[PDB]
Amino acid sequence: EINPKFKDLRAYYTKPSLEFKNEIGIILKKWTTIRFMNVVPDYFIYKIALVGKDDKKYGEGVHRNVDVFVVLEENNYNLEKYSVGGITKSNSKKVDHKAGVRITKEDNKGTISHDVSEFKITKEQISLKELDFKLRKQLIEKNNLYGNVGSGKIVIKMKNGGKYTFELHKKLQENRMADVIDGTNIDNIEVNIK
Ligand SMILES: [Cl-]
């Protein structure tokens, strides 16, 4: 049932995630090829890589009203607690929003199945990192993504008419992990797997 072709992707997207909300981030002096936002929600200092749009977005010093979606990863910076992107502005109000998920899957035998879920949204502003990670994990667990088949796309359709796309044959690009969208404006999610 489990094609070893998809081993790396299935491994990555079954990693545990952590969520730190209403926190502060501290950015110190640059000391390598990239900068980090430090978050300290427990006895650890989490080093959050500033990639893509985040590098210009957050200057040296203190940033308040930060939420981070964390997936701890191994890294080349010799850091114990490291994660990439996933930084968003904390809520300014309760958010209780639901977006329908429609899943079309075609296996190696050409069998076409359809499935549905509901993606619960509790955040005003949500990172692509979080949408991409939670949705793939769910598809692995419920729809056998990266089992029999491991290609296709997730598409997040915005109420404002726009859309964002995640190709399932590759890990989400690290620069896009820092991209953020308006959670309240997600309309529906379309997933096609083959
Ligand atoms: Cl640092």
Side-chain angles (χ1 to χ4, degrees), residues 56-85:
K56 280 165 181 51
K57 188 170 176 170
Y58 304 101
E60 179 178 289
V62 177
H63 298 276
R64 297 184 78 89
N65 295 128
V66 167
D67 280 11
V68 190
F69 177 74
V70 174
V71 178
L72 296 173
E73 284 186 45
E74 282 180 291
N75 66 96
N76 297 129
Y77 301 98
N78 201 45
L79 295 175
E80 184 185 359
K81 305 282 187 180
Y82 166 95
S83 182
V84 180

Short mmCIF file of all heavy atoms in Angstrom, two decimals, residues 56-85:
data_model
loop_
_atom_site.label_atom_id
_atom_site.label_comp_id
_atom_site.label_asym_id
_atom_site.label_seq_id
_atom_site.Cartn_x
_atom_site.Cartn_y
_atom_site.Cartn_z
N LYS A 56 12.51 41.10 4.98
CA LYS A 56 12.32 42.57 4.96
C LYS A 56 11.22 42.99 5.90
O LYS A 56 11.19 44.13 6.35
CB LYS A 56 11.92 43.09 3.57
CG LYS A 56 13.05 43.27 2.56
CD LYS A 56 12.45 43.43 1.14
CE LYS A 56 13.50 43.60 0.03
NZ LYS A 56 14.53 42.54 0.12
N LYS A 57 10.31 42.07 6.19
CA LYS A 57 9.12 42.38 6.97
C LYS A 57 9.49 42.65 8.42
O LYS A 57 8.90 43.53 9.06
CB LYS A 57 8.15 41.19 6.91
CG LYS A 57 6.77 41.46 7.54
CD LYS A 57 5.79 40.31 7.22
CE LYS A 57 4.45 40.49 7.90
NZ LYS A 57 3.41 39.48 7.37
N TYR A 58 10.44 41.90 8.96
CA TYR A 58 10.81 41.99 10.39
C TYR A 58 12.26 42.45 10.65
O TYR A 58 13.19 41.65 10.52
CB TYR A 58 10.62 40.67 11.14
CG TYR A 58 9.23 40.13 11.04
CD1 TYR A 58 8.95 39.09 10.15
CD2 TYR A 58 8.21 40.63 11.84
CE1 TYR A 58 7.65 38.60 10.00
CE2 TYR A 58 6.88 40.10 11.74
CZ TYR A 58 6.64 39.07 10.85
OH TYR A 58 5.34 38.58 10.71
N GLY A 59 12.41 43.71 11.08
CA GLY A 59 13.73 44.24 11.43
C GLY A 59 14.27 43.80 12.77
O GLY A 59 13.56 43.16 13.56
N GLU A 60 15.52 44.15 13.07
CA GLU A 60 16.14 43.83 14.32
C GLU A 60 15.28 44.32 15.49
O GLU A 60 14.72 45.38 15.40
CB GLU A 60 17.53 44.52 14.40
CG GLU A 60 18.22 44.24 15.73
CD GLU A 60 19.61 44.85 15.85
OE1 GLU A 60 20.54 44.38 15.18
OE2 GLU A 60 19.77 45.82 16.62
N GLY A 61 15.17 43.54 16.56
CA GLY A 61 14.48 43.99 17.77
C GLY A 61 13.28 43.12 18.10
O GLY A 61 13.24 41.91 17.76
N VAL A 62 12.30 43.77 18.72
CA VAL A 62 11.17 43.07 19.34
C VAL A 62 9.94 43.21 18.50
O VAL A 62 9.55 44.23 18.02
CB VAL A 62 10.94 43.60 20.79
CG1 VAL A 62 9.70 42.94 21.50
CG2 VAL A 62 12.18 43.32 21.63
N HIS A 63 9.26 42.09 18.30
CA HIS A 63 7.99 42.09 17.56
C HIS A 63 6.91 41.47 18.42
O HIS A 63 7.09 40.36 18.88
CB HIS A 63 8.15 41.26 16.23
CG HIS A 63 9.17 41.90 15.34
ND1 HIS A 63 8.85 42.92 14.49
CD2 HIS A 63 10.50 41.76 15.30
CE1 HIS A 63 9.96 43.36 13.91
NE2 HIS A 63 10.97 42.67 14.38
N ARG A 64 5.80 42.16 18.60
CA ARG A 64 4.79 41.64 19.53
C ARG A 64 3.59 41.08 18.75
O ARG A 64 3.49 41.29 17.56
CB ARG A 64 4.44 42.78 20.56
CG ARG A 64 5.72 43.11 21.38
CD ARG A 64 5.44 44.19 22.53
NE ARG A 64 4.79 43.43 23.59
CZ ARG A 64 5.38 42.79 24.58
NH1 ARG A 64 6.71 42.79 24.77
NH2 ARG A 64 4.62 42.09 25.38
N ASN A 65 2.68 40.32 19.39
CA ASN A 65 1.49 39.85 18.66
C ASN A 65 1.84 39.00 17.44
O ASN A 65 1.31 39.23 16.36
CB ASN A 65 0.61 40.94 18.11
CG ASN A 65 -0.03 41.79 19.20
OD1 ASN A 65 0.07 43.02 19.16
ND2 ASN A 65 -0.67 41.15 20.15
N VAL A 66 2.76 38.12 17.71
CA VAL A 66 3.22 37.07 16.77
C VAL A 66 2.60 35.70 17.14
O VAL A 66 2.61 35.28 18.32
CB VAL A 66 4.77 37.09 16.84
CG1 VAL A 66 5.40 35.85 16.17
CG2 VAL A 66 5.15 38.40 16.15
N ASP A 67 2.16 34.98 16.08
CA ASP A 67 1.70 33.60 16.18
C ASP A 67 2.71 32.85 15.24
O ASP A 67 3.08 33.43 14.24
CB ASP A 67 0.32 33.46 15.56
CG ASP A 67 -0.81 33.91 16.47
OD1 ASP A 67 -0.47 34.54 17.51
OD2 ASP A 67 -1.98 33.63 16.12
N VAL A 68 3.11 31.66 15.63
CA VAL A 68 4.00 30.82 14.76
C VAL A 68 3.45 29.44 14.68
O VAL A 68 3.08 28.80 15.71
CB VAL A 68 5.43 30.82 15.30
CG1 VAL A 68 6.39 30.16 14.25
CG2 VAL A 68 5.97 32.24 15.55
N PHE A 69 3.39 28.94 13.41
CA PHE A 69 3.09 27.55 13.19
C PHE A 69 4.50 26.92 12.97
O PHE A 69 5.17 27.35 11.98
CB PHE A 69 2.18 27.43 11.94
CG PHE A 69 1.88 25.99 11.61
CD1 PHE A 69 0.99 25.27 12.39
CD2 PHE A 69 2.55 25.36 10.58
CE1 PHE A 69 0.75 23.85 12.15
CE2 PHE A 69 2.36 23.97 10.33
CZ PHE A 69 1.44 23.21 11.08
N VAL A 70 4.84 25.95 13.79
CA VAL A 70 6.18 25.34 13.91
C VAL A 70 6.13 23.90 13.47
O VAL A 70 5.35 23.11 13.97
CB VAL A 70 6.77 25.44 15.36
CG1 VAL A 70 8.12 24.67 15.55
CG2 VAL A 70 6.90 26.87 15.75
N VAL A 71 7.11 23.55 12.62
CA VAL A 71 7.37 22.14 12.33
C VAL A 71 8.90 22.01 12.56
O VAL A 71 9.65 22.60 11.75
CB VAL A 71 7.03 21.83 10.82
CG1 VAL A 71 7.38 20.32 10.52
CG2 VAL A 71 5.55 22.02 10.54
N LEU A 72 9.33 21.36 13.64
CA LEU A 72 10.77 21.33 14.00
C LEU A 72 11.44 20.44 12.91
O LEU A 72 10.86 19.44 12.49
CB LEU A 72 11.04 20.74 15.33
CG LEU A 72 10.45 21.52 16.52
CD1 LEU A 72 10.64 20.71 17.76
CD2 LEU A 72 11.23 22.85 16.49
N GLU A 73 12.59 20.90 12.45
CA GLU A 73 13.28 20.20 11.33
C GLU A 73 14.75 20.14 11.62
O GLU A 73 15.29 20.96 12.38
CB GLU A 73 13.13 21.01 10.06
CG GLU A 73 11.82 20.95 9.40
CD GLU A 73 11.80 21.67 8.04
OE1 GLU A 73 12.74 21.51 7.21
OE2 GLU A 73 10.82 22.34 7.71
N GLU A 74 15.44 19.16 11.02
CA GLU A 74 16.89 19.25 11.09
C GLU A 74 17.43 20.29 10.10
O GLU A 74 16.74 20.76 9.18
CB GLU A 74 17.57 17.85 11.13
CG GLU A 74 17.46 17.28 12.56
CD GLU A 74 18.09 15.92 12.76
OE1 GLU A 74 17.55 14.93 12.21
OE2 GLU A 74 19.11 15.84 13.49
N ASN A 75 18.63 20.77 10.38
CA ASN A 75 19.10 21.95 9.69
C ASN A 75 20.63 21.97 9.62
O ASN A 75 21.29 21.17 10.30
CB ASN A 75 18.57 23.21 10.40
CG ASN A 75 19.13 23.38 11.79
OD1 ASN A 75 20.09 24.11 11.97
ND2 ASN A 75 18.53 22.73 12.79
N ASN A 76 21.17 22.88 8.80
CA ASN A 76 22.62 23.02 8.59
C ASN A 76 23.21 24.17 9.41
O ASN A 76 24.32 24.65 9.11
CB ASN A 76 22.90 23.31 7.12
CG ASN A 76 22.48 22.18 6.21
OD1 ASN A 76 21.77 22.39 5.22
ND2 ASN A 76 22.87 20.97 6.55
N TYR A 77 22.44 24.64 10.40
CA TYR A 77 22.89 25.79 11.18
C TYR A 77 23.28 25.36 12.56
O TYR A 77 23.54 26.21 13.42
CB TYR A 77 21.80 26.89 11.25
CG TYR A 77 21.36 27.43 9.92
CD1 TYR A 77 20.19 26.96 9.30
CD2 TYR A 77 22.09 28.42 9.28
CE1 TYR A 77 19.78 27.49 8.06
CE2 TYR A 77 21.70 28.93 8.03
CZ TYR A 77 20.56 28.46 7.44
OH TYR A 77 20.15 28.99 6.20
N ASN A 78 23.31 24.05 12.78
CA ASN A 78 23.51 23.45 14.09
C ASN A 78 22.55 24.01 15.18
O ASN A 78 22.95 24.28 16.31
CB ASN A 78 25.00 23.49 14.52
CG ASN A 78 25.35 22.45 15.61
OD1 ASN A 78 24.94 21.28 15.54
ND2 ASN A 78 26.10 22.88 16.63
N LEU A 79 21.27 24.15 14.84
CA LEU A 79 20.29 24.68 15.82
C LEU A 79 19.37 23.59 16.34
O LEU A 79 18.91 22.77 15.57
CB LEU A 79 19.47 25.76 15.16
CG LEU A 79 20.26 27.00 14.77
CD1 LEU A 79 19.34 27.93 14.01
CD2 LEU A 79 20.89 27.69 16.05
N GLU A 80 19.14 23.56 17.65
CA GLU A 80 18.39 22.48 18.24
C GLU A 80 16.87 22.51 17.87
O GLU A 80 16.21 21.46 17.68
CB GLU A 80 18.59 22.57 19.75
CG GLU A 80 17.98 21.48 20.61
CD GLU A 80 18.13 21.76 22.13
OE1 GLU A 80 18.75 22.81 22.51
OE2 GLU A 80 17.61 20.92 22.93
N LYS A 81 16.35 23.73 17.83
CA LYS A 81 14.91 24.02 17.62
C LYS A 81 14.80 25.04 16.54
O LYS A 81 15.02 26.24 16.70
CB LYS A 81 14.27 24.52 18.93
CG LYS A 81 14.46 23.60 20.05
CD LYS A 81 13.50 22.39 19.99
CE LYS A 81 13.59 21.55 21.23
NZ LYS A 81 12.67 20.40 21.14
N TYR A 82 14.45 24.54 15.36
CA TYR A 82 14.49 25.27 14.19
C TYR A 82 13.26 24.88 13.40
O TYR A 82 12.90 23.68 13.36
CB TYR A 82 15.78 24.83 13.43
CG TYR A 82 15.85 25.23 12.03
CD1 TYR A 82 16.52 26.39 11.64
CD2 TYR A 82 15.31 24.40 11.02
CE1 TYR A 82 16.55 26.77 10.28
CE2 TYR A 82 15.38 24.75 9.66
CZ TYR A 82 16.00 25.91 9.31
OH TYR A 82 16.10 26.26 7.99
N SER A 83 12.67 25.89 12.79
CA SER A 83 11.51 25.87 11.91
C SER A 83 11.53 27.00 10.88
O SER A 83 12.21 28.05 11.03
CB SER A 83 10.21 25.79 12.76
OG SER A 83 9.09 25.72 11.96
N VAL A 84 10.81 26.83 9.77
CA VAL A 84 10.91 27.76 8.67
C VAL A 84 9.62 28.50 8.37
O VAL A 84 8.62 27.85 8.07
CB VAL A 84 11.37 27.00 7.38
CG1 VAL A 84 11.47 27.99 6.26
CG2 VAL A 84 12.69 26.31 7.68
N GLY A 85 9.60 29.85 8.47
CA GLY A 85 8.40 30.59 8.07
C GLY A 85 7.28 30.40 9.12
O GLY A 85 7.61 30.09 10.26
#
